[PDB]
Amino acid sequence: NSPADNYTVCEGDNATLSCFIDEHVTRVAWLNRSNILYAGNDRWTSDPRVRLLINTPEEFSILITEVGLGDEGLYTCSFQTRHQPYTTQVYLIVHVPARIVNISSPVTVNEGGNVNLLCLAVGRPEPTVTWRQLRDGFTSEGEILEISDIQRGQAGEYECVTHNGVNSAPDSRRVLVTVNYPPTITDVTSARTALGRAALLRCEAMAVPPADFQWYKDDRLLSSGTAEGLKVQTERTRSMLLFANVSARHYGNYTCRAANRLGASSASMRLLR
Amino acid sequence: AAVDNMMVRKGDTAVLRCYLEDGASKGAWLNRSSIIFAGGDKWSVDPRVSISTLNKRDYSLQIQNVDVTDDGPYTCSVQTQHTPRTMQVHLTVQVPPKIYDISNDMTVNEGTNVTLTCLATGKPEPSISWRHISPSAKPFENGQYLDIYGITRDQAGEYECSAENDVSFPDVRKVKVVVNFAPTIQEICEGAGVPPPAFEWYKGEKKLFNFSTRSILTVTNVTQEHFGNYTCVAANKLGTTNASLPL
Ligand SMILES: *[C@@H]1O[C@H](CO)[C@@H](O[C@@H]2O[C@H](CO)[C@@H](O[C@@H]3O[C@H](CO)[C@@H](O)[C@H](O[C@H]4O[C@H](CO)[C@@H](O)[C@H](O)[C@@H]4O)[C@@H]3O)[C@H](O)[C@H]2NC(C)=O)[C@H](O)[C@H]1NC(C)=O
Ligand SMILES: *[C@@H]1O[C@H](CO)[C@@H](O)[C@H](O)[C@H]1NC(C)=O
Ligand SMILES: *[C@@H]1O[C@H](CO)[C@@H](O)[C@H](O)[C@H]1NC(C)=O
Ligand SMILES: *[C@@H]1O[C@H](CO)[C@@H](O)[C@H](O)[C@H]1NC(C)=O
Ligand SMILES: *[C@@H]1O[C@H](CO)[C@@H](O)[C@H](O)[C@H]1NC(C)=O
Ligand SMILES: *[C@@H]1O[C@H](CO)[C@@H](O)[C@H](O)[C@H]1NC(C)=O
Ligand SMILES: *[C@@H]1O[C@H](CO)[C@@H](O)[C@H](O)[C@H]1NC(C)=O
Ligand SMILES: *[C@@H]1O[C@H](CO)[C@@H](O)[C@H](O)[C@H]1NC(C)=O
């Protein structure tokens, strides 16, 4: 519709501009913006990257070596007949493959907080930034990603990807989000076992960072020592209080305590006969 | 230095200055995107376009008989080995206003409503305003059409249409109007009517044998037979009236 054609070349390539004319053309020239590059066989530009290829009375073509972002502009071919002037214009568009230049660091938040993740990429044409959740399929077309009231199931790796539609690869990058929540005791077991048989107590409280589980026998606490014949095994989500054989002093009330940086909890279980 | 926007009149000669730098520098003039001059070569086929070279460093574009078609952006690309120089100039060509139509000199009778037209053109668009020759009047509102309802006797005369522009505005043409009114006698005889009436002096049964606006009777060596009541009959194509007076 408009005589402004788009001629996109990859950065660093060579751009050749061909101007096709009939026989009755008196003058002809290629112009960068409003500055002449070549007027027939006369070189006007001081840039050695511009070379003259064809000056046949049927076509006038020049070459640009090592095309750069600064070379982007409207290139016109003005030529003259005996009666009227002519211009055929071309718009040089430089393409740069997309690449992420800034992305958020691995963030930690407390459960229910608010998280904002940014993924900044540069590229020409303007690159499309996309956020993705690696554990559960989710996509948001935006440079920034905000998570409100983030929960346990939303923590994980958040991949960012950007592409400018070029043949080159999208150069995606990933960021890990780890939410923190205080321990909540989910499961508690008490044992009513006879003398001579083994028994065990346990508590189940999941927390991030993992809760330091504490055991209490009546007032005192257990140290997992061979004295009194007791041994506690602590895990990431549990802590089993193990009783090998029996003992008269072992019978009584017990309490476990699971605590991390965000809170603490305690539950009471007994050991009976 | 020089100018970024240049305004000139239609038909004048415009000079777009573009002094270039010392050395072997070569200059080029550009109409829009096309080449007008490239150093010494004249790419243009127009006889009105030329280069005025006052000194070796001077490089100017001169357009004689500049027209509306010539308005637009002109670019002079001074080429220095270090960095090229560019001095674009937007040319605006002005057309003085021209009143191309106006109502003919008309003579319409009194009481009617008449509309006077005055159409003009130019670049930019002119504004048409009206006025009345008579001193006892107010300037009418800016409108190409002037409509008067029930025109009176005193509203006749010349109406001066004025088409104005911000620059080189003078464009004044007049149209005279004459309102015809049935004559009425104001004093006895003495009257006023248009077209000028032929006063008839009728004494009694018949008229027996004179300023344009007045009629003077002669009464010397008065006789007893002459005494009586006479009438002043003023008749025109529009109307006739009579007024008596004793003597
Ligand atoms: C078409 O015309 C436009 C202007 O009308 C022209 O743009 C110019 O491009 C050149 C480079 O092609 C630019 O010069 C560069 O400027 C940057 C700063 O932004 C510098 O960092 C660059 O330095 C490099 O190159 C120097 C010389 O080669 C080296 O000495 C240096 O070490 C670096 O390697 C360089 O100077 C210039 O600023 C623009 N000008 C404008 C107004 O945009 C474009 O190049 C023209 N295209 C063609 C194909 O001729
Ligand atoms: C490039 O493509 C766009 C598509 O919308 C078109 O409008 C334009 O005229 C083209 N040429 C240019 C920008 O020189
Ligand atoms: C561009 O042309 C130059 C010389 O003609 C050549 O050396 C260079 O390899 C070309 N560019 C590419 C990408 O081949
Ligand atoms: C990216 O932008 C953020 C926004 O504040 C900034 O804190 C950070 O330093 C930038 N760089 C990286 C590598 O995240
Ligand atoms: C065990 O718990 C009960 C009820 O809470 C309490 O009355 C009792 O005193 C506890 N045992 C000991 C040895 O304190
Ligand atoms: C000069 O430029 C104008 C556009 O502003 C164009 O209409 C005209 O044809 C050009 N050339 C001449 C000789 O007027
Ligand atoms: C103009 O004159 C005509 C003819 O008498 C009349 O019918 C009309 O009402 C008049 N217009 C105005 C606005 O007085
Ligand atoms: C005056 O004119 C009227 C109208 O024609 C007529 O009736 C009347 O007789 C006239 N009187 C005299 C004195 O001329």
Structural domain boundaries in chain B: 5-95, 97-180, 181-246
Cβ distance A35 to B84 less than 8 Å, yes or no, reads yes
Is A192 near chain B, with CB under 8 Å? Answer: no
Alpha helices in B133-218 (DSSP H): none
How many beta carbons lie within 10 A of that of residue B245, not counting itself?
12
Q: Shortest CB distance from A27 goes to which of B43, B84, B88?
A: B43
In whole angstroms, give the CA distance from residue B156 to residue B176.
8
Q: How many helices (H) and strands (E) does chain B have?
A: 0, 20
Answer yes or no: are the C-beta atoms of A135 and A156 closer than 8 Å. yes
In whole angstroms, give the CA distance from residue B247 to residue B226.
8
Which chain B residue lies closest to A74 (C-alpha atoms)? B33
Residue of A7, A9, A30, A32 to test ligand 1 pocket, by largest number of atoms within 8 Å of CB: A32
At B185, list the tokens: 């006698």
Question: Are A167 and A103 within one domain?
Answer: yes
Question: Are A187 and A273 within one domain?
Answer: yes
Answer yes or no: are the C-beta atoms of A233 and A152 closer than 8 Å. no
Q: A124: closest CA among A151, A102, A92?
A: A92
Cβ distance B43 to A36 less than 8 Å, yes or no, reads no
In b/e form, how buried is each residue of A49-69, taking b as 16+ CB within 10 angstroms?
ebebeeeeeeebbbebeebee
Instruction: Specify if A257 maps to a domain.
Output: yes
Q: B42: closest CA among B53, B32, B54, B28?
A: B28
Tell me the three state secondary structure of residue B121: strand
Q: B22: closest CA among B51, B62, B59, B52?
A: B59
DSSP secondary structure letters along B64-78 = SS--GGG-EEEEEEE
Indicate the DSSP class of residue A34. T
In whole angstroms, give the CA distance from residue A259 to residue B227.
145
Identity of residue A75: Y
Q: A254: closest CA among A197, A226, A213?
A: A213
Nearest CA to ligand 8 atom 11: B242
Residue A127: is the preceding peptide bond cis (ω within 30°)?
A: no
Beta-bridge partner residues of A62: A17, A52
Answer yes or no: are the C-beta atoms of B53 and A18 closer than 8 Å. no
Cβ distance A34 to B33 less than 8 Å, yes or no, reads yes
Indicate the DSSP class of residue A161. E
Tell me the three state secondary structure of residue A178: strand
In whole angstroms, give the CA distance from residue A186 to residue B177.
108
3-state SS, B224-235, equals CCCCCEEEEEEE
- Tracing tokens 């399929």 back to the chain, one arrives at A137
Report the DSSP pairing between strands A4-10 and A85-103: parallel
Q: A106: closest CA among A170, A63, A157, A41?
A: A157
Ligand nearest to the CA of A64: 1
Cβ distance A44 to B26 less than 8 Å, yes or no, reads yes
Cβ distance B33 to A84 less than 8 Å, yes or no, reads no
Nearest CA to ligand 2 atom 5: A6
Domain-ending residue, one of A128, A148, A182: A182
Q: Is the CB of B115 under 6 A from ligand 7?
A: no
Q: B101: closest CA among B69, B145, B40, B148?
A: B145
Total residues belonging to chain B: 247
In whole angstroms, give the CA distance from residue A19 to residue B114.
65
- Tracing tokens 């017990």 back to the chain, one arrives at A254
Residue numbers preceding breaks in chain A (C to N > 2.5 A): none
Which chain A residue lies closest to B38 (C-alpha atoms)? A39
Question: Are A51 and A122 within one domain?
Answer: no
At A88, list the tokens: 């055929």
Ligand nearest to the CA of B82: 1
Ligand nearest to the CA of A125: 2
Answer yes or no: are the C-beta atoms of A125 and A95 closer than 8 Å. yes
Indicate the DSSP class of residue B139. P
Range(s) of the domain holding residue A69: 6-97
Beta-bridge partner residues of A123: none
In whole angstroms, give the CA distance from residue B175 to residue A158.
85
Q: List, as own/partner pairs, every contact residues B34-43 make where C-beta atoms lie below 8 angstroms and the sequence separation is at least 24, other chains included.
A: B34/A78, B34/A85, B34/A86, B34/A87, B35/A27, B35/A29, B35/A31, B35/A36, B35/A78, B35/A80, B35/A85, B36/B61, B36/B74, B37/B61, B38/A27, B38/A29, B38/A36, B38/A39, B41/A27, B43/A26, B43/A27, B43/A78, B43/A80, B43/A85
Indicate the DSSP class of residue B180. B
Ligand nearest to the CA of A104: 4
Answer yes or no: are the C-beta atoms of A58 and A15 closer than 8 Å. no
- Phi, psi at residue B66, to the nearest 5°? -65, 145
In whole angstroms, give the CA distance from residue A68 to residue A12.
6
Is A167 near chain B, with CB under 8 Å? Answer: no
Residue numbers preceding breaks in chain B (C to N > 2.5 A): 188, 209
C-alpha pair distances (Å), B120 with each of A67, B163, B189:
55, 6, 48
Terminal Cα-to-Cα distance of chain B (whole angstroms): 92
Cβ distance A84 to B88 less than 8 Å, yes or no, reads no
Q: List, as own/partner pairs, every contact residues B35-43 make where C-beta atoms lie below 8 angstroms and the sequence separation is at least 24, other chains included.
A: B35/A27, B35/A29, B35/A31, B35/A36, B35/A78, B35/A80, B35/A85, B36/B61, B36/B74, B37/B61, B38/A27, B38/A29, B38/A36, B38/A39, B41/A27, B43/A26, B43/A27, B43/A78, B43/A80, B43/A85
At B1, list the tokens: 């230095």
In whole angstroms, give the CA distance from residue B154 to residue B177.
11
Q: B16: closest CA among B69, B67, B60?
A: B60
Identity of residue A10: C
In b/e form, how buried is each residue of A139-159, taking b as 16+ CB within 10 angstroms?
ebeebebebeebeeebbeebb
At B141, list the tokens: 């509102």
Q: Shortest CB distance from B81 goes to which of A31, A46, A89?
A: A46
In whole angstroms, give the CA distance from residue B148 to residue B173.
19
Is A222 near chain B, with CB under 8 Å? Answer: no
Identity of residue B61: L
Cβ distance A36 to B35 less than 8 Å, yes or no, reads yes
Instruction: Specify if A1 maps to a domain.
Output: no
Ligand 5 site: residues with CB under 6 angstroms? A 218, 252-253
Question: Are A77 and A148 within one domain?
Answer: no
Cβ distance A27 to B35 less than 8 Å, yes or no, reads yes
| Domain total of chain A | 3
In whole angstroms, give the CA distance from residue B3 to residue A161.
51
DSSP secondary structure letters along A26-43 = -EEEEEETTEEEEETTEE
Answer yes or no: are the C-beta atoms of A77 and A31 closer than 8 Å. yes
Instruction: Give the nearest ligand 5 atom to A270 CA.
Output: 1
C-alpha pair distances (Å), A260 with each of A138, A181, A186, A256, A265:
31, 9, 15, 14, 9
In whole angstroms, give the CA distance from residue A259 to residue A266.
9
Instruction: Specify if A34 maps to a domain.
Output: yes
How many beta carbons lie within 10 A of that of residue A82, not counting itself?
8
Question: Are A203 and A152 within one domain?
Answer: no
Q: B51: closest CA among B43, B63, B33, B67?
A: B63
At A44, list the tokens: 């006007």
Domain-ending residue, one of A140, A155, A182: A182
In whole angstroms, give the CA distance from residue A39 to residue A58.
15
Cβ distance A34 to B45 less than 8 Å, yes or no, reads no
Which chain B residue lies closest to A44 (C-alpha atoms)? B79
Answer yes or no: are the C-beta atoms of B78 and B18 closer than 8 Å. yes
Question: Are A90 and A104 within one domain?
Answer: no
At B24, list the tokens: 């072997």
Tell me the three state secondary structure of residue B32: coil
Q: Is the CB of B65 under 6 A from ligand 6?
A: no
Is A2 near chain B, with CB under 8 Å? Answer: no
At A63, list the tokens: 């070459």
Report the run of H or E that residue A74 belongs to, with start and end: strand A73-80
Is A26 near chain B, with CB under 8 Å? Answer: yes
Nearest CA to ligand 4 atom 2: A102
Report the run of H or E that residue B62 belongs to, with start and end: strand B60-63
Identity of residue B233: V
Identity of residue A93: I
The CA R_g of chain A, rounded to the nearest whole Å, is 37
C-alpha pair distances (Å), A69 with each of A66, A140, A141, B134, B178:
10, 30, 27, 72, 76
Q: Shortest CB distance from A39 goes to which of B38, B84, B88?
A: B38
In whole angstroms, give the CA distance from residue A251 to residue A248.
6
Which chain B residue lies closest to A77 (C-alpha atoms)? B34
Domain-ending residue, one of A70, A97, A124: A97
Report the DSSP pairing between strands A50-54 and A59-64: antiparallel
Question: Are A103 and A83 within one domain?
Answer: no
- Tracing tokens 């440079």 back to the chain, one arrives at A143
Nearest CA to ligand 1 atom 18: A70
Question: Are A193 and A235 within one domain?
Answer: yes
Residues 39-68 (A) with a CB less than 8 A from some CB of B: 39, 44, 46
Positive or negative: CA dihedral A10, A15, A21, A26: positive
Q: A76: closest CA among A66, A87, A67?
A: A87
Identity of residue A110: N
Report the run of H or E that residue B184 belongs to, with start and end: strand B181-187
Identity of residue A223: S
Instruction: Specify if A230 maps to a domain.
Output: yes
Indicate the DSSP class of residue A219. T
